[PDB]
Design a protein around this ligand. Structure first.
Ligand code: COA
Ligand code: COA
Lengths: 311, 311
């Protein structure tokens, strides 16, 4: 069984507060907090790109996993903001990490990308093909934000998270998963000709508030478990109201759902692993815990994983 | 075992001849032919994007496979020229094809992308997770070509190729594969700030002429076969001199190597499946044939597959 051997992240230093944003566009700290839950989000420096953030997250994850870059068989990077289209971020960090035997691709599934990558890595490991797969979710959303558009500029931040995936013992490891998509919703969230993100907020909200809870129940079910068996929920961190609907569907207490949206905003493919590190560092996730992760992104993509933490 | 159930392509109508290119830049039909083997390459219309080409190729492949879009579990699209970064091409055709149950991601490994996708699909099928995986290599290289740069503008064309991957019977199916990368070579082939491809031609040539033959021998070996067992070789169609080195390494006759570079030029991730359709339509590939495919791309990525044709 494939499981998670270690996790790491890179959080940019610069903080953008809601009062910072009150000078940039016509918004209010009150509106942002009440409608999204966001208070702050980090912004990468103009000389910091997805590659920089991804290699930092990756090093932390390799160190925590006790895995040398030399032993990586594959590097997957979920991003829509590579430094450039090619060389990919995965190729770049394969070089900067010294993972010379690893293959490398970038995958594109917007905010669900980390879920696609972890599941892809699982297949390569449980086939016996590969042993160690590095999976990075990284996004410099600030580089594709129209910073004069209040409807999106108060939502996005930058960051990177990474996990080393590999064989784990006994009951441990990824128990079940779900990947999905609906291109019908492509009109509702797209990158335009200016490299500016355009969103029909209300439409994405309606779709996500239904699909995130259903994907969660689906993986619990496929894992042969009950709602009562879930120890922690790590949803995509885009809107506290969407996260709360998922929590309600799983009948989980507040303390069993990761919430970092108030401090990092929506970091797309980086959001789940960033939150995962936060709870691990807080000691809130233990070996043996059944953890449900669920993500939702542009193109209308989604994914979910049930994992039993530990090696 | 996962194998290829059907294949299809989309070839743009507009032909760009070497004499067409003689008016655009300072080149000669003689130089282009002697140094690359290219005579013509197709160019998509200004209103034709990767999504259009990919859906056309995909329909042809579904029809040949006798597979309804409704039954697709996953759509992978290898491209670096999506209509826009998100919605992805895979999401867009998931919609246009009516493949509502399928998940969808785009993967990025430049000219090796189709190989990464097929191998990814194999893992999902041989795990028992999925049954039908659509894999498309599509590129509108004309949209990232500096058409005033002779060093690259005489090399690239547009197109799309697609395969339906699924379980096949007995000895059939993908016998072995290799995926690799070397981010060290990222400096030698990259997309610049103008969305223009920049290449150190001589350096990419040196690397590809060594790696393509070695990847071929590696998959033959892992499949437990000999050079004498190979019935056909489908290399990436970028330079007849690079293809010829691979042929020489495998001691294969001319007639057992696909050559379409003279008519389509380098179409990156689309090149191998386009050539595969060409030989199938010519009747040169039969059920039971051991086919070696090998590709090499920017970021310095590469991949190879040995497959026994048939279902
Ligand atoms: C984007 C989102 C935060 C907006 O919240 P919402 O409840 O949809 O808000 P609405 O779009 O209905 O607009 C509510 C009002 O606030 C206004 N408004 C929008 N952005 C505002 C801002 N930054 N500051 C103040 N008012 C704002 C709207 O114009 C509207 O005013 P009106 O009623 O006078 O026309 C929310 O829909 C969302 O997060 N959607 C899901 C997106 C997701 O899942 N994340 C992935 C994105 S990559
Ligand atoms: C790009 C490539 C066709 C160029 O051929 P090459 O043998 O490397 O040619 P060189 O770069 O050594 O240049 C040879 C000469 O031709 C010239 N030249 C380059 N492009 C030319 C053109 N279009 N027309 C005429 N002369 C040209 C060079 O300036 C040089 O002239 P010089 O000796 O006076 O300086 C070849 O290197 C190649 O295909 N490389 C591999 C790329 C690959 O694998 N494909 C992936 C790309 S996405």
């Amino acid at each position: 069984k494939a499981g998670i051997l270690g996790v790491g992240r890179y959080i940019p230093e610069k903080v953008l507060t809601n009062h910072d944003l009150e000078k940039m566009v016509e918004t209010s700290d009150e509106w942002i907090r009440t409608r999204t839950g966001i208070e702050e989000r980090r912004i990468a420096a103009d000389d910091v790109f997805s590659s920089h953030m991804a290699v930092a997250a990756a090093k932390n994850a390799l160190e925590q996993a006790e895995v040398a870059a030399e032993d990586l068989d594959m590097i997957l990077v979920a991003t829509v903001t590579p430094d450039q289209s090619f060389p990919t971020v995965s190729c770049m960090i394969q070089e900067q990490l010294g993972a010379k035997k690893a293959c490398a691709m970038d995958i594109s599934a917007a905010c669900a990308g980390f879920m696609y990558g972890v599941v892809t890595g699982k297949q390569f490991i449980e086939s016996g093909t590969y042993k160690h797969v590095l999976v990075v979710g990284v996004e410099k959303l600030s580089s594709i934000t129209d910073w004069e558009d209040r409807n999106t500029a108060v939502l996005f931040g930058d960051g990177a998270g990474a996990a080393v995936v590999g064989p784990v013992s006994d009951d441990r490891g990824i128990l079940s998963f779900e990947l999905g998509a609906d291109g019908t919703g492509g009109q509702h969230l797209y990158l335009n000709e200016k490299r500016h993100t355009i969103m029909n907020g209300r439409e994405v909200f309606k779709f996500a508030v239904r699909q995130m809870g259903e994907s969660c129940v689906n993986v619990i079910e496929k894992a042969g478990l009950s709602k009562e068996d879930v120890d922690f929920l790590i949803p995509h961190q885009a809107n506290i109201r969407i996260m709360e609907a998922a929590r309600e569907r799983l009948e989980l207490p507040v303390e069993k759902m990761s919430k970092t949206v108030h401090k990092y905003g929506n970091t797309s493919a980086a959001s789940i692993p960033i939150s995962l590190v936060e709870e691990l560092e807080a000691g809130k996730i233990k070996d043996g815990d059944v953890v449900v992760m669920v993500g939702f992104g542009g193109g209308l993509t989604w994914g979910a994983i049930a994992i039993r933490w530990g090696r």
